[PDB]
Design a protein around this ligand. Structure first.
Ligand SMILES: Cc1cc2nc3c(=O)[nH]c(=O)nc-3n(C[C@H](O)[C@H](O)[C@H](O)COP(=O)(O)OP(=O)(O)OC[C@H]3O[C@@H](n4cnc5c(N)ncnc54)[C@H](O)[C@@H]3O)c2cc1C
Ligand SMILES: Cc1cc2nc3c(=O)[nH]c(=O)nc-3n(C[C@H](O)[C@H](O)[C@H](O)COP(=O)(O)OP(=O)(O)OC[C@H]3O[C@@H](n4cnc5c(N)ncnc54)[C@H](O)[C@@H]3O)c2cc1C
Ligand SMILES: NC(=O)c1ccc[n+]([C@@H]2O[C@H](COP(=O)([O-])OP(=O)(O)OC[C@H]3O[C@@H](n4cnc5c(N)ncnc54)[C@H](O)[C@@H]3O)[C@@H](O)[C@H]2O)c1
Lengths: 393, 394
């Protein structure tokens, strides 16, 4: 009968819920899952619908289908704030109560306080957002035939050359032949620009793979501006600093992949956070709070070996949920808990539909091999939450 | 030796060129065809791509494929003005000289000086235009999911309940189930509004056909506002006058089918025009110029029997091309020419993919029968200009 509530049905949230489903026995606890939408979207593949290389429906699944209900109660609503003292959470259309709290609200875009970014730029963070990005670009290409002078319609600027930016421009480059044919556009006129403040694309990554990534993307017509930061964002385009002087790029479409931050709700609810994320204990709990757990991008963990923190990823997020699910079972049964130890296997980044790069098991991988791996790994997630049934669909 | 120049590759233009092609024996005259694009689009079917019910490629064909290269020389360029005195036409990328001139530049949207109409509203008049309208609407639906409070995204206002407007709103209603499913939208929230200044939808049409049209469209959720004029057009929406008082409609998409005028080029070239169109003589030429011919929407014709003017249509435009081609051929070859006599067969209006209305001959038509009738008649044009080969390609 205790009331555990999980906030967000993302990688951290949905796995924690499914873990609880398998682990526990009917009526042992009251579990409620809260989500903004009635569907759970595969964030790792969201860059593809934004380009238009994949339908958005292939990147999402209905939550009710995943759960058997009765054990877990699903609430479709929007979280507003956290009342920790009165162990309750407030929604736009109601209020909920928790004995135990699991926080997996994912990330929010990090704008760095840059002017006009929130107003005039797009983010790849949801099914709704990527649909908007996709239709915006196609809309812009449609307008070009009427006004051939306006080449800014055909200019797409992606801010930041992180994994998200690199994956996106790769998909974008692949789409352009089909896109140009649809709207009678000269492929040569199209400009896809990736702008990176850091001196190198994909900073903190193996130079061998990075150069390979740039080489392939450069061949597909992607343009890279490195050591160039975005100072400001305008409706017309963006403003960048080159050689200590401001320069302007006129782009009808600006996508911001500059970084991510923890959900503002967590920080605004009075938690102590760094970059909006919580530095949790070995048991994935929020300091000074024995009944609160943080999962996914909201959680922050530091590798004891080095001084740097683990990056926010789906891979570690899945591991968060499974750990919390097991630990929650122990707490409900009055048992001890197990410290969280993250096993970070290789990471693979796609460079389009048929190409990819990654370091897996210490070994570097490229080409069709890496592409098949990522497709395989992503499919493994489908099996984890939906079984062979989900993989087929 | 003589230089025949044809302006525009629309219904009037393309048929006139093809008519000359069949009629003449090469080298007899120098024929040049001028078009804004290297393709000829089926304007009668343009309402479907704008809605998104049909691909735009099915509504156009390449001009070079249709014509006999050696006999007719095709120029892809944009007409700027016509110099009647010097008998030359000026383009963005050159100049051309004519002994005989055929003008089929089609129509331009008529805004009637209404504020913001040209700036903030869309027109269904080209391949480029319908693509813009289509992607615009899908874009607004995409934004709605993020902001469910903004129901104006799902509101589409079509100005004028003429022939074009009725076809467009009919196509739109059919699209909505597929469109709503794509962007997770509640169909009940969607509003398709047709605004008519006249007291009745489809003025000057059989009330029986009109009532059927409103009934079918009304069932699909289409809303009609009649006796209501559009005072102004804004990015936010439109302003309308109801019961002598101003009212507001919030619509992300505004499409203007309120009417058309002849191409501005004809008027700016010093021609004498009414509503931008030329009232031609029985030989479809502009008074008193014996060597200039006007075809399609640019031309204005009066029915001798009923004194009322013919509406600007593709059907009469096609007949213009055939008449001018025959008359031009006769003129260079010696003939006495033939006065233009329009044979106006029935007209059919689609009310969606599976429904239609029309008066053919003396009998009124409805349902799948009318739809098949309209589809067949449209196919006749494809055969006329492209043969069985063009007909195959859908
Ligand atoms: C294009 C892209 C590609 C990526 N590829 C990879 C990859 O290949 N490998 C890898 O390891 N990582 C990848 N990542 C990173 C990974 O997707 C994130 O780290 C992952 O989303 C984190 O899991 P999460 O559940 O905490 O976040 P999320 O998946 O975003 O969980 C958010 C969920 O909580 C809901 N929610 C949020 N706020 C509220 C609120 N106020 N009220 C109600 N519901 C709310 C949301 O609707 C959503 O359902 C990628 C990220 C992006 C953008
Ligand atoms: C949705 C819609 C549905 C319709 N359905 C029917 C129907 O069912 N039956 C019927 O009889 N009529 C119908 N009509 C009307 C018909 O389409 C027109 O009346 C017909 O096109 C008139 O012939 P036209 O060649 O003069 O016009 P157009 O087809 O518009 O001729 C214009 C051509 O010349 C080109 N051009 C224009 N300006 C320039 C320029 N400055 N320089 C170079 N090239 C230029 C254009 O690109 C185009 O190729 C419909 C119209 C619309 C909008
Ligand atoms: N295959 C994978 O494992 C995979 C794929 C995608 C994302 N991810 C993870 O998702 C997380 C989110 O990554 P992300 O791509 O959203 O951001 P990021 O933090 O990983 O990279 C941000 C980049 O943007 C640049 N940048 C920031 N501000 C800028 C500005 N004003 N102008 C120009 N450039 C600017 C930074 O230098 C940085 O290189 C990462 O931890 C990443 O590791 C993993």
């Amino acid at each position: 009968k205790p009331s555990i509530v999980i906030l967000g049905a993302g990688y951290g949230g949905i796995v924690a819920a499914l873990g609880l489903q398998k682990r526990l026995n009917y009526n042992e606890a009251d579990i409620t899952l809260v989500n903004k939408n009635d569907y759970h979207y595969i964030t790792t593949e969201l860059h593809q619908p934004a380009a238009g290389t994949m339908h958005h429906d292939q990147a999402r699944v209905g939550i009710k289908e995943l759960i058997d209900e009765k054990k877990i109660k699903f609430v479709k609503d929007t979280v507003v704030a956290i009342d920790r003292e009165q162990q309750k959470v407030t929604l736009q259309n109601g209020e909920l109560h928790y004995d135990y709290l699991v926080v997996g609200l994912g990330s929010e875009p990090e704008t760095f306080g840059i002017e006009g970014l929130r107003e005039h730029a797009f983010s790849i963070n949801s099914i709704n957002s990527v649909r908007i990005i996709r239709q915006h670009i196609e809309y812009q290409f449609a307008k070009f035939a009427a006004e051939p002078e306006r080449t800014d319609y055909l200019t797409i600027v992606v801010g930041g050359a992180g994994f998200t930016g690199i994956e996106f421009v790769g998909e974008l480059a692949d789409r352009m032949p089909e896109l140009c044919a649809e709207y009678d556009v000269d492929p040569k006129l199209v400009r896809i620009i990736n702008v990176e403040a850091a001196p190198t694309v994909l900073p903190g990554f193996d130079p061998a793979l990075v150069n390979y990534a740039m080489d392939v993307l450069g061949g597909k017509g992607v343009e890279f501006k490195i050591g160039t930061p975005i100072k400001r964002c305008t409706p017309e385009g963006v403003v960048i600093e080159v050689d200590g002087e401001e320069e302007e790029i006129k782009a009808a479409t600006v996508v911001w992949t500059g970084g991510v931050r923890g959900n503002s709700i967590v920080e605004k609810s009075g938690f102590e956070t760094m970059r909006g994320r919580i530095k949790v204990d070995p048991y994935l709990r929020a300091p000074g709070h024995e009944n609160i757990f943080i999962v996914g991008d909201c959680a922050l963990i530091i590798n004891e070996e080095n001084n740097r923190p683990y990056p926010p990823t789906a891979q570690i997020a899945i591991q968060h949920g499974e750990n919390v699910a097991a630990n929650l079972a122990a707490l409900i049964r009055g048992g001890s808990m197990t410290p969280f130890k993250p096993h970070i296997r290789g990471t693979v980044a796609s460079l389009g539909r048929n190409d990819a790069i990654g370091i897996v098991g210490g070994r570097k991988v490229y080409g069709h091999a890496a592409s098949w791996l990522k497709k395989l790994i992503d499919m493994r997630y489908l099996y984890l939450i939906g079984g062979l049934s989900l993989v087929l669909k």
